[PDB]
Ligand binder design. Structure first.
Ligand SMILES: Cc1cc2nc3c(=O)[nH]c(=O)nc-3n(C[C@H](O)[C@H](O)[C@H](O)COP(=O)(O)O)c2cc1C
Ligand SMILES: Cc1c([N+](=O)[O-])cc([N+](=O)[O-])cc1[N+](=O)[O-]
Length: 349
């Protein structure tokens, strides 16, 4: 098996195993509405076996960055429908990544309200993008009832993604955002049904997954994880146990795939997660053609997602096939505004 062999995820046939990683780019129209510029960008990248969209918030309280899209209202649905129709016409496939940032936010995005979290524990560091440099606030710990409200926002978001014509949804369970905050012991000190045991810590992620399953069928739902707990001030007392429990429970549900941001190192727990899960495993983080092909050949992965190389190379799959040079990425325009550093990276000539 190589990167260029087709794979099925659930009942969706992909033409290759080169996956476009979910990538926040901050190019939405005011009101967090997907636009034609975004449609152009995704169309350019439609040769990907599957596109995982930029993280897309399921509610106004789940945003923490400027100009990132939502999926909670009809205006946003209409904007996304233009994106998915264009991707499909270009021969591509796309899942919407469902997001809630939890504590990783700032009151300026929330009309002065505090970000919400399982527990009132301030994340270290400064809010990205916000200027002047600001610390994160201490978040407000959610009431039990409010957590059910959040599950409903994910359910509605999943319904809205289906109306918008996506091929599936991926649950953002990674990178220190809301679901990951509940999952890990350092950030969750709750004593209701949503904290205080592994079963309880994983509960929110699984309730959101089950809601998505009702809308989509599990074989059109994926989950994103960050098992090294290395972004946004995370930390868990037994991550081998935590993430394999999640993997087992997701596998019981027959979900389409797990995609983990976890570069290869001796402490990679990906193999434990893959085995517990039993379904297609998508590795990610610092992979190149050679190491991706090596992981496929060794059975450590079923597909490989590429982030930065897809930012800079719309025709990444053709470039990989040809062992062609790759465009250099410009991190100064990963975020920010407009077409420069977004739709102006060239295709092979
Ligand atoms: C600019 C940028 C935006 C990203 N946005 C997201 C995101 O919205 N959701 C997510 O799960 N990961 C996001 N990531 C992480 C990437 O999906 C990926 O895990 C990371 O870039 C490592 O893979 P790579 O070495 O192939 O780039 C982002 C990364 C970058 C650089
Ligand atoms: C490293 C990282 C993030 N971070 O700053 O800790 C955040 C991401 N995100 O989803 O916004 C993604 C990241 N990543 O995969 O490299």
């Amino acid at each position: 098996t190589t990167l260029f062999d087709p794979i099925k995820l659930g009942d969706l046939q992909l033409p290759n195993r080169i996956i476009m990683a979910p990538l926040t780019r901050c190019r939405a129209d005011e009101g967090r509405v997907p636009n034609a510029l975004m449609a152009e960008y995704y169309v350019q990248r439609a040769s990907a076996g599957l596109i995982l969209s930029e993280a897309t918030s399921v509610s106004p309280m789940g945003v923490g960055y400027p100009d990132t899209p939502g999926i909670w209202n009809d205006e946003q649905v209409r904007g996304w429908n233009n994106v998915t129709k264009a991707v499909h016409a270009a021969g591509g496939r796309i899942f919407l990544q469902l997001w809630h940032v939890g504590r990783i936010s700032h009151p300026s995005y929330l009309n002065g309200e505090l970000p919400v979290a399982p527990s009132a524990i301030q994340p270290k560091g400064h809010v990205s993008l916000v200027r002047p440099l600001s610390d994160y606030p201490t978040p407000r710990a959610l009431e039990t009832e409010e957590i059910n409200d959040i599950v409903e926002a994910y359910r509605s978001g999943a319904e809205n993604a289906k109306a918008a014509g996506f091929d599936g949804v991926e649950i953002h369970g990674a990178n220190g955002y809301l679901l990951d905050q509940f999952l890990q012991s350092s950030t969750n000190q709750r004593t209701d049904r949503y904290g205080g045991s592994l079963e309880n810590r994983a509960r929110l992620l699984l309730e959101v997954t089950d809601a998505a399953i009702e809308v989509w069928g599990a074989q059109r739902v994926g989950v994103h994880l960050a098992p090294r707990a290395d972004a946004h001030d995370m930390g868990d007392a037994d991550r081998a146990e935590t993430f394999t429990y999640v993997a087992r429970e997701l596998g019981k549900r027959g979900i389409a795939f797990i995609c983990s941001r976890e570069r290869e190192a001796d402490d990679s727990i990906g193999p434990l997660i893959k085995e517990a899960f039993g379904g297609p495993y998508i590795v990610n983080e610092r992979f190149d053609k050679a190491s991706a092909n090596a992981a496929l050949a060794s059975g450590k992965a079923d597909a490989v997602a590429f982030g930065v190389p897809f930012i800079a190379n719309p025709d990444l799959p053709a470039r990989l096939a040809a062992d062609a040079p790759l465009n250099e990425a410009h991190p100064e325009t990963f975020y920010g505004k407009g077409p420069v550093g977004y739709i102006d990276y060239p295709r092979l000539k």
